[PDB]
Design a protein around this ligand. Sequence first.
Ligand SMILES: Cc1onc(-c2ccccc2)c1-c1ccnc(N)n1
Length: 344
Amino acid sequence: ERPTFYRQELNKTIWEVPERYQNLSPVGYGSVCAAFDTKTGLRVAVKKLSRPFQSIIHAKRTYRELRLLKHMKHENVIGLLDVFTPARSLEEFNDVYLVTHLMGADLNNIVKCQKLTDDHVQFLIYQILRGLKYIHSADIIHRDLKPSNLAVNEDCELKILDFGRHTDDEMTGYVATRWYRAPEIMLNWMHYNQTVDIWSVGCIMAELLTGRTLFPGTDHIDQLKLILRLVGTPGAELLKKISSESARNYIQSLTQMPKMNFANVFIGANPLAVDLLEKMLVLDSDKRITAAQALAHAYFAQYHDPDDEPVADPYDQSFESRDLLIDEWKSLTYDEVISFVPPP
Ligand SMILES: Cc1onc(-c2ccccc2)c1-c1ccnc(N)n1
């Protein structure tokens, strides 16, 4: 049946949670507390969504996040341990809490201005690609892959968190929020797809290899110039695919540049790593390596197992193109909370 809930003000917010969750301590859309789940013995992160149904946009976002997390069942991706509301009925339903494994440290905490060993890079990138193969098989695009969205424990085990989002202000200037974005998304060149995530993986892998940001642009234009210096300016083939006439006109104003030699950029790196980087960091998204293809690349020889890289169950996201009222999104959300089944 229904657990017993207890009340607690954490900072300046009232949190009402089942008794199983103890020692709630603030750690960070909503707010997150770390807690101890006495039922499972797990250190958990508990997220209370802020005004989940304040608008149609917010209500749809709440449903989106809950649907996403309920679907994700993979070792290298965030899983949903629990979801609850103190509400006893749809009528009084106003708050949503989400529970997952507590992230202790992220990728940034492990890079820390320093190079990693090649075996470490292999293992870390393998896990991102393993997770991505799974995410992409469900036709989901992360859209926001960066080191701070990747949890890594003490045994170097990685999970992809925080699916995509970001406003114009936070994408402005010398900011990590933009350094890992594919150029087609950064400058809205075209209708983008799953390959945007592969670009991000390339930027991440390079940074693990060198210990430095691959494209630390001081703004959109600076970052584009950094990108084109490395990969070369686009050819006619890609230009046609830039459906944004305006973005295409600006690109054409730039002096043509050839692709650089990646072995001269990534001095001393495993030639197999260099090769993979060349296949990920392709300007034309149509021609980038996919996660499934990248898993089979020689660089991951010691970790690759085609029988241990699972795909996702089908994910129905027809709700995305659906127009509903707040109360309707709210009822859908309530249905999903009530139907939740915890993992074993
Ligand atoms: C960041 C972030 O953004 N959303 C969540 C979240 C998602 C679902 C349930 C609980 C927390 C987290 C998160 C996840 C794990 N650990 C920590 N410290 N934070």
